[PDB]
Amino acid sequence: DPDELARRAAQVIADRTGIGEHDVAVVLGSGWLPAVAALGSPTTVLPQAELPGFVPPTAAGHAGELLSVPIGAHRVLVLAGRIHAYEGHDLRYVVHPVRAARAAGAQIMVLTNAAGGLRADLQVGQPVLISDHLNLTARSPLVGGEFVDLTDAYSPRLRELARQSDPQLAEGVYAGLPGPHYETPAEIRMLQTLGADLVGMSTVHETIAARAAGAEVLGVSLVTNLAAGITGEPLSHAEVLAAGAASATRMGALLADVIARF
Template sequence: MNSPYLQGDALAAAVEAAAAKLRAAFGDAPTIAVVLGSGWSSASDQLQNVQRISYADLPGWPLPKVEGHVNEVVVGTTAGGARVAMLRGRAHTYESGDCTGMAAPIRSLKAWGVQVLLSTNASGSLRQHQPPGSLMLISDHINAPQRSPLVGVQGSHRFVDMSCAYDLELRQTAAKLAKEIDQRLCEGVYCWALGPQFETPAEIRMFAAWGADAVGMSTVPDTILARHAGLRVMGLALITNMAAGLSAEALTHELTLREAKDSGERAAGFLSALLDRLTALESLKAA
């Protein structure tokens, strides 16, 4: 199957050009970039002093067609003064069968000077203590399809250590903040399923037996790409439904979007406070 995304030397050239365009549009890179998944779009609406650039103006960047994704980079400041970049759209593997769709954006962010990728998503819960509306801090992931965006990459640096893919200091910071402001924040393992169909009850039972706490159709390729690029990573999942077989409700994309909309403002508020706290970390200031 031919990839719809740039590869090899063409990708490298596009990344260099896109990083230059980001620098020209926004100046120096913020410390943190956030990929906004379903339900998280209101986070960008809360930013102040906003500047924007379309993915269409950035060489090599994908133009996802998933409902709720706007396909633009937004740079602004939180109410607490943290300057951040937010990506309003991500390429999903189920759109093309190719899991390299976020290679150009993530490598461009690194080339621009970003240090942390904070990946957000909407997920289904495998645990009754984590109902719809909950937030889950991703501690680890399971790559159920065993697909990698690094296939074909040359050199020893392709063998990326994933033993602590989701940065411990960043997770501890999020957990401490949640406790301080009385925000319920579960922590658990995210399982990536390829999609676009939802999982069967039997698959959900298998994932639960593997140790998964939530399931979704994104994030893992982004994390692999980010770790390969040398970015620190953290992940937040907004629980929008109980996974197949755990409730009587039929699973639909509309259900996901509806629950995400209902819970999105609260999730965005926590994200804003978290960005303020993360930006103040000495380990990021010194980098």
């Protein structure tokens, strides 16, 4: 039962942070990890591996951390380092952070990710709010039949608050694929025809579990490269890494400023 496990995690977080409950959670994906320090200095820093349900028993190594950071008047749970579906782990582990945070009282989830840009106006290094998504993984983190509507899965209200911080923020449709491989140029032309503006390898399941758990969602992509076949040249791993490293401080500041308005 994912619910009872998130419940236990929430209890551990409360006792380890001294904070009765948190209000917001932020998931830092690829291209957003170096922006952690910019969100604010943490009051508590604890390894995900020491928290119930975060890391699967078999496969291991060293998970990220879970930070408790005060931002504005909020107590924010910051997840630095997520476990991906491409490793083969059940999706309950992928969405556990969201479920635990909700159990911890978090009602807003800020989900970030690295993404390839498909719409012509999007540039490398540009953060883009997610207006909607295309779940192209043929999976779901939900088991059983509860009713879960995904209309406005990415709260228009929260996107409006984000624009108070930066009125020029672009908005677009994110396509979530299984990965880990990047797409062929043919696949990118396909995604374009399907209405995708951004392409990535995460986030969709977290959004679904979030909405199912009663939380609002703000998604933010960092365009780390133009999608395959667009430039006429192969992708550059170096560029993808630099996109995240360079905008680190700027991205951390933006998120803190936005979250403060929540």
